[PDB]
Design a protein around this ligand. Sequence first.
Ligand SMILES: N[C@@H](CCC(=O)N[C@@H](CS)C(=O)NCC(=O)O)C(=O)O
Lengths: 121, 121
Amino acid sequence: MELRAATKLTEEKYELKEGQTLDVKCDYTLEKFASSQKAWQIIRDGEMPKTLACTERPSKNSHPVQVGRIILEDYHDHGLLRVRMVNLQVEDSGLYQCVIYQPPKEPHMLFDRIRLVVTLE
Amino acid sequence: MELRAATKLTEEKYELKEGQTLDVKCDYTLEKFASSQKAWQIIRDGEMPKTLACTERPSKNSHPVQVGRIILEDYHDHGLLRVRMVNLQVEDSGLYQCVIYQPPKEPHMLFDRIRLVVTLE
Ligand SMILES: N[C@@H](CCC(=O)N[C@@H](CS)C(=O)NCC(=O)O)C(=O)O
């Protein structure tokens, strides 16, 4: 049986300097995802992500999640997941992505990645 | 910066009977991916894969890799990565995908997934 390569996930280069804060808006728009569990992860080689911060399950509006220098927030009203990394270190450089936990029997809607490049002043 | 969950990743619902052998062909086709490391993974919720079998890095042609009932083979000459799961069992049911280890700056190409469904005799 044949499995095609009919998909590509880009890496939107996002550059900032050390000390500065990362601000990303992950517009899932479809309220059909509001209650869905979402997370922010750093992508390791082989498409193996490591979860840095996730929302509760279900995900209730206006309940920011703080994990270290990470702030995750699910705004249902505008249907978007807002992610933030304060006081970026150069070591933070890497591939990141927002993720919406969705069931196996349904096609998955995927966010493109963020190639974070943190530089020195 | 704001992104959208703009790409679909579908699960090819595939049915097989216990005891059969799942034979899958993953067409990366481009010579550019011939020596890249590759793997067979089962996906868990949150887009978190569990690597069941991977090639060497680099991947050498016709160097069969076997782990358990899983047999992986990279056919450079065909631009295909072949995967086999011998004597299938009900527990083998799940969401699977071939993966090509790709560098961070390049858009990552992704193979269609397969929702394996193994049922009783
Ligand atoms: N984030 C993980 C990945 C497992 C997962 O999603 N874990 C936390 C997320 S920060 C959670 O309670 N999620 C449960 C669920 O969705 O299974 C860990 O570092 O333990």
